[PDB]
Amino acid sequence: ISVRGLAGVENVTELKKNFNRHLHFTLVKDRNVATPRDYYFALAHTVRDHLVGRWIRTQQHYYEKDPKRIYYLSLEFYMGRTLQNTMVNLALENACDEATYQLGLDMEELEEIEEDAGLGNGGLGRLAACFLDSMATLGLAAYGYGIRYEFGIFNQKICGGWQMEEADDWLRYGNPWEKARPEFTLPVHFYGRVEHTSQGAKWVDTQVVLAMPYDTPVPGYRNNVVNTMRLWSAKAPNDFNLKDFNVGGYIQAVLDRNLAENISRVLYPNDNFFEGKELRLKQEYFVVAATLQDIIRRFKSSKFGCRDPVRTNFDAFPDKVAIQLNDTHPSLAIPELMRVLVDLERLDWDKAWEVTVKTCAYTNHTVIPEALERWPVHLLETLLPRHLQIIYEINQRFLNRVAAAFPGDVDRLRRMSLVEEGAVKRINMAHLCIAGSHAVNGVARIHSEILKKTIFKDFYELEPHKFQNKTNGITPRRWLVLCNPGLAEIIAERIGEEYISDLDQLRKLLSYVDDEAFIRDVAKVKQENKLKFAAYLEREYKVHINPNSLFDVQVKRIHEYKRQLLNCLHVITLYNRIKKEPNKFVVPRTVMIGGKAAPGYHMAKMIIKLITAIGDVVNHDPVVGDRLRVIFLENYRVSLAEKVIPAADLSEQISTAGTEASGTGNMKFMLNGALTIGTMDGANVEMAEEAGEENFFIFGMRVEDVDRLDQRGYNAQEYYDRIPELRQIIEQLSSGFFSPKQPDLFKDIVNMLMHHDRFKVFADYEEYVKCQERVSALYKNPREWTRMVIRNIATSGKFSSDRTIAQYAREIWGVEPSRQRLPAPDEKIP
Amino acid sequence: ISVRGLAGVENVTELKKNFNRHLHFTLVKDRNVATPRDYYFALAHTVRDHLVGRWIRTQQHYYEKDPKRIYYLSLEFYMGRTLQNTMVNLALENACDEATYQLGLDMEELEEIEEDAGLGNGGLGRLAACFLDSMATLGLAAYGYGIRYEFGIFNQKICGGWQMEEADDWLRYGNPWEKARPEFTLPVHFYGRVEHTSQGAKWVDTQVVLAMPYDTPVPGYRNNVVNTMRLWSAKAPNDFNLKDFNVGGYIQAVLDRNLAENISRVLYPNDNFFEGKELRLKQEYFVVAATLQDIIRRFKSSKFGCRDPVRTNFDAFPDKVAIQLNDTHPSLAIPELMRVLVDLERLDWDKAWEVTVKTCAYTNHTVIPEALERWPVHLLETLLPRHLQIIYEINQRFLNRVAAAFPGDVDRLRRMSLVEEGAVKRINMAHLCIAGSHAVNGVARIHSEILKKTIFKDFYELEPHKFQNKTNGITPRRWLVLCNPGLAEIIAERIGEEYISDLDQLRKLLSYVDDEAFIRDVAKVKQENKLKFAAYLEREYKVHINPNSLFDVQVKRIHEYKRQLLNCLHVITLYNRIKKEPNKFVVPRTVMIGGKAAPGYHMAKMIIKLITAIGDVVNHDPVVGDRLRVIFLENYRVSLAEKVIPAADLSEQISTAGTEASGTGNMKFMLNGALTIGTMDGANVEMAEEAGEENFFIFGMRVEDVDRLDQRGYNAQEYYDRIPELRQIIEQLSSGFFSPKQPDLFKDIVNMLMHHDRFKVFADYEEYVKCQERVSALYKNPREWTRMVIRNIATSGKFSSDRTIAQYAREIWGVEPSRQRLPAPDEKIP
Ligand SMILES: O=C1N[C@@]2(O[C@H](CO)[C@@H](O)[C@H](O)[C@H]2O)C(=O)N1O
Ligand SMILES: O=C1N[C@@]2(O[C@H](CO)[C@@H](O)[C@H](O)[C@H]2O)C(=O)N1O
Ligand SMILES: *Cc1c(COP(=O)(O)O)cnc(C)c1O
Ligand SMILES: *Cc1c(COP(=O)(O)O)cnc(C)c1O
């Protein structure tokens, strides 16, 4: 059937009875009233059963051996569905497929019922998920720590061409994967004030919110290792949240508990944008405060909570603990770690600081200013008074270090301050992370360099040793084996299976680049993938597409810097050219654009309306026929990504050079047999460098060109004046060609494009369509297109998160990865 | 060990492995980190396993045979713990005891970990629970329908002698008994307006709240029948509760979902008191609207949703459905049933009314005015506009019936109206229930008569056939076998086990009234029970009592009509007499008073402070010694009741004649070997009538005496003037003898007692202490005290809820009870 494992005689039989056990005893249903949803759950529970055994021994193991522990703090974990992934990592896919078949059910139909764990916005959240999978696969004693939002990223609905947001009640029917651990609930404080008494400061008169942990298992790939992802939930204490007496109402007191519990209610839907709301800050401290207590508790036990030097010496803390900050969201972990060490454990400042810096590491994910976290002091002042005092003290000492290194450099001092003066004083979380971490890293080579040359230049001059790079990657398991079993099979037919946990081995495929059979096969799976997607489209969304056309897709969050608008201009151009010479042949294309716009991002929501507007015109023009279709992919999410990417021919990664930190969707497309048209931005540079620029469609300004243009000054009018095709499009928008009933509907877009384009869309227009012509040319030559594909796929190895994690492990955490199978799952009950 | 069933070889082995299965796979724990709470859950899950098989066949059975269905609507279901009760009804107690013993655990210690299902205030809620157990035991196709509050009755804490309320988070660690059924979620409407168009009225522009059902199994006693208790939970729709666009904030929209979900958040803590809050009304319509849709759906399927006359003829509705209204809380079911039938199904008014009246039955639970539900019209007008129109129409037609029966009786007309004029117009829910039901019943003979003679006299004259009586009862399973296995064993040793489901058989114990062995045994278990309780007291609450003294206990909600105050006066009297003649012998007593006071009931909270105040003085007077102890039983609840009642010697049921509808605690004490001192009120009358007045300690005014006194006019001063002992107590309170630091602390109590005692406490004082002397006299003669006990126990049979339910079944529902064992639980998987 494929290499989804063995469909053993004994195990298929075993699976079936357990499926029935759960349908009866767990779901309390009988075959006569069970619905597909019930069947999905019976299975989920049956599969979940197979990894609890391993989960328990893994955790027990780490307790015995006591290795250095890795704590990945992130406010986002974009997990997606987990049924299939679990079957794959446990080599259960074929057995389950067989068993469910014998039970008369279609496993695939059941998998579609699982809701997505959308506790993330996009790239940042998904990276965290891929990392977790890789850390488990590499045998690291790692724990993912986050917030268990009851409402993840909103579900996107397109009404009249507009995006409509609606709550994502992913827990409505329950989550068979998590395990509530109410017995490990911890308290978290807010507000209050600071008392300075005799021997130390005291954080007093605080409001308490409880943090209840929920554990979700993270299985490594076929190595019997199952790590843990701990998500915190906010719960109100039953005392003060009722006990603070003297009139108000008993009923009201109980109803008001949903005020402390609102902390973990919903994820903020912003991608690459900072919103200074109190609720957000509360979420940030919540996950940090709770997690740290859990980290220290585990440390106090270790082998110190037995003997060792005997005396809670936190000197070995950094030798046993490593906490990675996914962006600045969990930045409060630094001043919080100090608070505990200094205020509670009573360590001297300097000893505490040394420990803190040695255990903390920060990862930066963007360079755009509006995404940078700068919290107003009055907020920190009210909500976390002691933390503010600690930050000021950290700042004081840090600046003193600077002054001593650059005597007289007074401007440098204000520039590096963690505190920003002005309208309102703010705290620059990024400066905080750099100062309190022993390593700061970028997510792509170019991005990392930009940090050193630009944004954090002063910091780099002060401590050049801190700065590193760790190019992002993706998991070959979910992003290849899971979503594209067809391609994975033919690859395995030639080079084996060892590449799933050693993607570098894909290079061996280079020697089949001229293989007639392979070329035919690679081309076959892609054709099958396009047919399956074209079907899914009519199934769930309804209104036909042509599977023979070039599948041109751009899927990622909607942003001005991602330039979906640039993609739009090309589409309209294609349309106009066809309308000019109707009977001229052109390579058919189905351009698919999908992504979510943050609710408050007006421009982004305007662009979505534009895309659908274009499709309304283009898709109903009889002269165009099936040569050009414009489709907006609704509710783009992980599960949807697993469907389009494998069916894509052309991957669009066209951000303005220097704005996309790295990108990961690009990597997903490269590994699944799609060719990339893009700019020298983020990881695109390393991808082309890996596959050879001849096998990539690069175009547009490089970073330097962008800067040159900024010195000069960007004037869009020039481009409007010198390019008729471009002018023609702008006037079409301006006159309502795409919005008849509302002629001025797109005035904001035009106005912006002509007068305030921060991302110079026009500057890359010419080189973009020219480049687009080159890909159409190559598509006309199937054999050569496929050979170029084989060059990309065979060379994507470097982009596996296993590589990235191995680097973090060695160069930052100080731990050695291991592909050693944990001693089976075997029963055991001590 | 006892008759808690057989500890079979095969089953104890089977139990143990399943216990382990759950500890591992369900709880995801290993023996090395498992805590008592974990062990309790492993067991709970293991036990729950044994009744899902029976649960499924029971429900399937009712689907095949299609009998008349009984729907018990109540806003309260005071369930308590359910582990032990389930073991008892399934004959699993000894096997589980053995198995857990072999696993090295103390079952009793684990049972104490289970949280109480406190979804009730007191008597009314507990009755519902006992009924459910009896309906299952009698093989009725009955369903308990209610609200799944996430916060039940508050947990009571005594701080400085005062009651402190704190949220009862009973779901904190989960509820292993319930089964969420999100797939059966129903919509419920609120607000909106009424459109009258061509063919009918339409309820429009309503706000929607979803109702999610949760099923809890209700096992009959050893008959393999497992009925269902369906509790609704409020859930917000994800559309409009987000989709009603045009600014407000996406985050705020999501946080605001906890506004529609507040409906099922908390139970109103009022007992015998009406609070006209909108939230309460919302809870009432919520449970009614959801339940009815479920009732009709089930009906539409029946055997009509196949063939029959073919044409949704609701003529057979009453032959297939019976809905019992537990008090007026679910009264909206009447106008709602009409709404559906008339508005949606399109039946003519008269046909709809005939059906409604024929399927609805109302049970009244109190006669005090402040407990009567009278909803302001402006509230119904805003929240349920169509229902108001229906009520007015029901009223119109009803009054027309009255006018026709009593021509010219204009005062009768305004008296019987469902609508009450005055300050604000109100709707008398009680009048509504009488008019729309085919039967109205009281809960005790005297209470039922009072309804006919007083409160509902006019209604009785109009339709004398509607009025009946159904004396309350309690379940012998939980209230005897479960809480007093010792007494149950010795009874079974002589007369067998058939009495557990046929309590009348207890009469056979009369012939052992002179049996020397029995007398010794009955006396022995009571001594063991008192020793166990005296221990529990020092264990969990700490501060000693004497197990040789008379256990004088009064446990029930705190009310002015229950007269805990009268009990207080006696206690102080005993104290004063001892202080007068220290070296005179008196029968030692431990008087225990416990109960919860509604948060807003100032007087009730004042009485609690008084009780503790008395104990502070009495319990620390060296001259008193161990002859007199005053203890306030904290957080009285079902689980606590199961501990005190079996250890009680004297049961206090001293309400003012005519105020306690029936009472059930009284019955609990009678069946557990305690003697009763009380007034001729509620079921007390029937109890003494059953055991013979010579075996009861009756005292005080009868109902007639109370009325005579009211004609005359009640003046407390008289009693104050003629009784020195009484005067002495009042002046002690007035001068701060019991409240040194705050001398005027009890001025409200004294003031009330002297000037506004609605329950004439003073009027029964003399006869009460005199009577109390008689019980002390009898306690001095162990042999005779025990013989009188045997007379009570042997004669309590009539007070089993099996008797009550059998009467409801035959005289109201039109169904025949059956003690037929359902065809085993045996596997089966069709
Ligand atoms: O704030 C960010 N930064 C992002 O991080 C991702 C993972 O590092 C990068 O691949 C992406 O290029 C960057 O924009 C991202 O997707 N979001 O939301
Ligand atoms: O409103 C009432 N009515 C009550 O109903 C119980 C069950 O019918 C009766 O036994 C009790 O006497 C009556 O007060 C009760 O306990 N509450 O709260
Ligand atoms: C991988 C992924 C992303 C990131 O895409 P980029 O192209 O790097 O912005 C965002 N959303 C989903 C659902 C993804 O799977
Ligand atoms: C039985 C019971 C009641 C009712 O007691 P009465 O004496 O009838 O008022 C109230 N609370 C609990 C916990 C009970 O078990």
Interval between CA A271 and ligand 1 midpoint (Å): 8
Who contacts A129 (Cβ-Cβ below 8 Å, separation ≥6)? A77, A78, A79, A80, A120
Task: Tell me if A25 and B49 make a contact (CB, 8 A cut-off).
Answer: yes
| Planar angle of CA A201, A206, A208, nearest 5 degrees | 130
- Sign of the C-alpha dihedral computed for residues B170, B175, B177 and B183 taken in this order: positive
Is A568 annotated as contributing to ligand binding? Answer: no
Q: Which ligand is nearest to the CA of A472?
A: 1
Which residue, B593, B612, B602, B596, is CA-closest to B558?
B596
DSSP state of B324: E
Q: Are B272 and B317 in contact (CB under 8 A)?
A: no
Interatomic CA distance for residues B166 and A241, integer angstroms: 8
A37 vs B contacts (CB less than 8 Å): 183
Interval between CA B638 and ligand 4 midpoint (Å): 8
- Using CB atoms, which residue from B243, B599, B830 is nearest to A164? B243
* Residue B91, phi-psi category: left (phi > 0), alpha (psi -120 to 50), beta (remainder): left
Interatomic CA distance for residues B668 and A759, integer angstroms: 80
Helix axes A349-359, A385-405, angle to 10 degrees: 90
Who contacts B346 (Cβ-Cβ below 8 Å, separation ≥6)? B200
- Give me A558's structure tokens: 């909607």
Q: Are B336 and B374 in contact (CB under 8 A)?
A: no
Q: Are B667 and B642 in contact (CB under 8 A)?
A: no
Active site (annotated) includes residue B557: yes
Which residue, A361, A431, A372, is CA-closest to A402?
A431
Q: Three-state DSSP class for B233?
A: strand
- Structural domains for chain A: 1-473+801-824 (3.40.50.2000), 474-800 (3.40.50.2000)
- Using CB atoms, which residue from A25, A60, A167 is nearest to B30? A60
> What b/e sequence results for B271-303 when a residue is b if at least 16 CB atoms lie within 10 Å of its CB, and e otherwise?
bbbbeeeebbbbbbbbbbbbbbbbbbebbeebe
Interatomic CA distance for residues A4 and A2, integer angstroms: 6
Within 10 angstroms of residue B193's Cβ, the number of other Cβ atoms is 11
- Sign of the C-alpha dihedral computed for residues A655, A660, A665 and A668 taken in this order: positive
CA distance B280 to chain A (A): 11
- Give me A208's structure tokens: 């308490």
Q: Is B358 exposed, middle or buried (0-12, 13-18, 19+ CB in 10 A)?
A: middle
* Residue B74, phi-psi category: left (phi > 0), alpha (psi -120 to 50), beta (remainder): beta
Active site (annotated) includes residue B668: yes
B255 touching chain A per CB within 8 A: yes
Is B298 annotated as contributing to ligand binding? Answer: yes
- Using CB atoms, which residue from A239, A241, A266 is nearest to B254? A266
User: Pairing relation of β-strands A419-420 and A207-219?
Assistant: unpaired
Interval between CA A337 and ligand 4 midpoint (Å): 52
Q: Which residues pair with A228 in a beta bridge?
A: A143, A217
* Residue entry with tokens 């007289």: A408
Interval between CA A429 and ligand 1 midpoint (Å): 17
Number of H helices, E strands in chain B: 32, 25
Active site (annotated) includes residue B755: no
Who contacts A276 (Cβ-Cβ below 8 Å, separation ≥6)? A374, A375, A376, A379
- Using CB atoms, which residue from B60, B172, B254 is nearest to A151? B254
CA dist list (Å): B555 to A90, B245, B632: 58, 54, 10
Write out residues with Cβ below 6 Å of ligand 3: A 122-123, 126, 556, 636-638, 641, 663-665, 668
Interval between CA B333 and ligand 4 midpoint (Å): 27
Q: Three-state DSSP class for A591?
A: strand
Q: Which phi and psi angles does A697 have, rounded to 5°?
A: -110, 80
Who contacts A591 (Cβ-Cβ below 8 Å, separation ≥6)? A552, A553, A554, A567, A571, A628, A629, A630, A631
Interatomic CA distance for residues A197 and A184, integer angstroms: 32
Task: Give me the long-range contacts of A477-481 (CB less than 8 A, separation at least 24).
Answer: A477/A85, A477/A88, A477/A89, A477/A133, A477/A137, A477/A221, A478/A80, A478/A85, A478/A130, A478/A133, A478/A642, A479/A130, A479/A645, A479/A667, A479/A668, A479/A671, A479/A672, A480/A671, A480/A672, A481/A88
Interatomic CA distance for residues A475 and A478, integer angstroms: 6
Q: Are B52 and B610 in contact (CB under 8 A)?
A: no
Is B271 annotated as contributing to ligand binding? Answer: no
- Give me A287's structure tokens: 């996950």
* Helical residues (DSSP H) of A619-746, grouped into ranges: 638-644, 665-671, 684-691, 703-712, 716-722, 724-734
Within 10 angstroms of residue A494's Cβ, the number of other Cβ atoms is 14
Interatomic CA distance for residues A398 and A404, integer angstroms: 10
Interatomic CA distance for residues A682 and A659, integer angstroms: 8
Interatomic CA distance for residues B61 and B72, integer angstroms: 20
A164 vs B contacts (CB less than 8 Å): 243, 245
Q: Which residues pair with B426 in a beta bridge?
A: B376, B420
Active site (annotated) includes residue B629: no
Interval between CA A364 and ligand 1 midpoint (Å): 9
CA dist list (Å): B55 to A516, B136, B245: 63, 11, 45
Task: Tell me if B167 and A257 make a contact (CB, 8 A cut-off).
Answer: yes
Who contacts A367 (Cβ-Cβ below 8 Å, separation ≥6)? A447, A450, A451, A454, A455, A658, A659, A661
Indicate the length of chain A as a whole number.
Answer: 830
Interatomic CA distance for residues B68 and B320, integer angstroms: 4
Task: Tell me if A28 and B183 make a contact (CB, 8 A cut-off).
Answer: no
Within 10 angstroms of residue B821's Cβ, the number of other Cβ atoms is 12
- Give me B354's structure tokens: 């005939």
Which residue, A21, A223, A6, is CA-closest to A95?
A6
Q: Are A413 and A369 in contact (CB under 8 A)?
A: no
Q: Which phi and psi angles does A634 have, rounded to 5°?
A: -75, 145
- Give me A755's structure tokens: 């007068």
Interatomic CA distance for residues B207 and B205, integer angstroms: 7
User: Pairing relation of β-strands A201-204 and B426-428?
Assistant: unpaired
Which residue, B17, B200, B220, B66, is CA-closest to B137?
B220
Active-site choice (B386, B387, B556, B637): B556
- Give me B568's structure tokens: 């207080």
Among A477, A556, A650, A659, name the best residue to mutate to test ligand 3's pocket (greatest count of ligand atoms within 8 A of Cβ).
A556
CA dist list (Å): B695 to A519, B119, B515, B539, B689: 101, 36, 18, 35, 10
Q: Which ligand is nearest to the CA of B75?
A: 2
* Residue entry with tokens 């609840």: B637
Which residue, A329, A374, A358, A384, is CA-closest to A146?
A329
* Residue entry with tokens 């700019």: A679
Q: Three-state DSSP class for B594?
A: strand
Q: State the catalytic residues of A.
A: 365, 556-557, 562, 664, 668
Containing H/E element for B155?
strand B155-159
Write out residues with Cβ below 6 Å of ligand 2: B 121-124, 127, 271-272, 365-366, 371, 443, 472, 660-664, 682
Q: Resolution for this model in angstroms, one decimal place?
A: 2.4
* Residue entry with tokens 């080189």: A767
Interval between CA B72 and ligand 4 midpoint (Å): 20
Q: Are B294 and B41 in contact (CB under 8 A)?
A: no
Q: Is A34 exposed, middle or buried (0-12, 13-18, 19+ CB in 10 A)?
A: middle
Is B257 annotated as contributing to ligand binding? Answer: no
Is B133 annotated as contributing to ligand binding? Answer: no
Q: Are A597 and A608 in contact (CB under 8 A)?
A: yes
DSSP state of B62: H
Nearest CA in chain B to A172: B182
CA A202 to chain centre: 38
Residue at B619: amino acid letter: N
* Residue B185, phi-psi category: left (phi > 0), alpha (psi -120 to 50), beta (remainder): beta
Q: Which phi and psi angles does A233 have, rounded to 5°?
A: -120, 140
Containing H/E element for A377?
helix A377-383
CA B195 to chain centre: 41
- Give me B655's structure tokens: 């309400």
* Residue entry with tokens 């680097």: A807
Within 10 angstroms of residue A369's Cβ, the number of other Cβ atoms is 9
CA distance A828 to chain B (A): 9
- Give me B244's structure tokens: 């009603």
CA dist list (Å): A730 to A614, A744, A749, A753, A763: 13, 12, 10, 9, 15
Task: Tell me if B28 and A599 make a contact (CB, 8 A cut-off).
Answer: no
Is A297 annotated as contributing to ligand binding? Answer: yes
Q: Which residues pair with B143 in a beta bridge?
A: B71, B228
Give the DSSP per-residue string, B189-223. Answer: EES-EEEE-SSSEEEES-EEEEEEEEEEEEE-SSS
Q: Would you give the end-to-end CA distance of chain B in angstroms?
A: 39
Task: Tell me if A56 and B28 make a contact (CB, 8 A cut-off).
Answer: yes
Interatomic CA distance for residues B394 and B379, integer angstroms: 18
**Whether the CB of B665 sits within 6 Å of ligand 4:** yes
A165 vs B contacts (CB less than 8 Å): 242, 250
Q: Choosing among B18, B25, B28, which should be mutated to test the A contact, i.e. which has the most A CBs within 10 A?
A: B28
B602 vs A contacts (CB less than 8 Å): none
Interatomic CA distance for residues B676 and B686, integer angstroms: 13
Task: Tell me if B257 and A172 make a contact (CB, 8 A cut-off).
Answer: no
Which residue, A372, A375, A335, A374, is CA-closest to A357?
A335
Active site (annotated) includes residue B45: no
DSSP state of A136: H
Is A71 annotated as contributing to ligand binding? Answer: no
- Give me A523's structure tokens: 């081309």
- Give me A540's structure tokens: 């769930």
Please give the biggest Cα pair distance in chain B.
90
Q: Are B653 and B799 in contact (CB under 8 A)?
A: no
Which residue, A670, A217, A651, is CA-closest to A484?
A670
Task: Tell me if A173 and B182 make a contact (CB, 8 A cut-off).
Answer: yes
- Give me A559's structure tokens: 């942003």
Interatomic CA distance for residues B26 and A96, integer angstroms: 21
CA B159 to chain centre: 27
- Structure-determination technique: X-ray
Q: Are A338 and A393 in contact (CB under 8 A)?
A: no
Q: Are B219 and B136 in contact (CB under 8 A)?
A: yes
Residue B558: half-sphere exposure toward Cβ, Cα within 13 Å? 29
Residue at A230: amino acid letter: R
Nearest CA in chain A to B252: A266
Please give the biggest Cα pair distance in chain A.
90
Write out the E strands in A129-288. 142-147, 155-159, 162-166, 179-180, 186-190, 193-196, 201-204, 207-219, 226-235
Interatomic CA distance for residues B686 and B796, integer angstroms: 10
DSSP state of A636: -
Residue A210: half-sphere exposure toward Cβ, Cα within 13 Å? 18
* Helical residues (DSSP H) of A454-548, grouped into ranges: 457-462, 485-495, 516-536
Which residue, A531, A602, A529, A618, is CA-closest to A568?
A618
Q: Which ligand is nearest to the CA of A668?
A: 3
Interatomic CA distance for residues B625 and B627, integer angstroms: 6
Which residue, B257, B287, B278, B260, is CA-closest to B186?
B287
